Amino acid sequence: SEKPYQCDFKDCERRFSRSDQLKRHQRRHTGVKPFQCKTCQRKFSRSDHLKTHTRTHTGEKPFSCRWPSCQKKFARSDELVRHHNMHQR
DNA sequence: AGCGTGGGCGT
DNA sequence: TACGCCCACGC
Ligand SMILES: [Zn+2]
Ligand SMILES: [Zn+2]
Ligand SMILES: [Zn+2]
């Protein structure tokens, strides 16, 4: 296929074009969590999710609302997406 | 609301 | 292989 990296775990049929994508996926089956927060010691399956988790400790909110007169800002881009959607609907 | 944790995707 | 990015769903 164009998706040679197939998951063979029991009752899973997912396949991927990339072996690293498959490796990340399989952590949902094994429970493996390689990335640990240095502040609170919680462990995470993914590096990017550790990174956004750490902002919960610092209050860093790099994503600011663009709506005039709005002061809201957010830790993650998707929070801001939801928020912008809210303003116009 | 805030944030866990998958996906496709880029580099 | 490393690390994320945005998108999205689900509490
Ligand atoms: Zn699988
Ligand atoms: Zn933490
Ligand atoms: Zn706003």
Distance CA A66, CA A80 (A): 9
Documented resolution in Å: 1.8
Burial of A8 (0-12, 13-18, 19+ CB in 10 A): exposed
Taking Cα atoms as reference points, which of A86, A80, A51, A52 lies closest to residue A64?
Answer: A80
Number of domains in chain A: 1
Could you list the residue range(s) of the whole structural domain that residue A10 is in?
Answer: 1-89
Residue A51 CA to C3 C1' — how many Å?
A: 10
Kindly report the CATH number assigned to the domain that includes residue A28: 3.30.160.60
Positions of strand B less than 7 angstroms from a protein CB:
1-10
Give the pair of three-digit tokens for residue A50.
Answer: 């550790």
Distance CA A37, CA A14 (A): 29
Taking Cα atoms as reference points, which of A68, A69, A75 lies closest to residue A54?
Answer: A75
Taking Cα atoms as reference points, which of A78, A74, A54, A51 lies closest to residue A63?
Answer: A74
DSSP designation for A30: H
- Nearest nucleotide to A79 by CA–C1' distance? B2
Method underlying the structure: X-ray
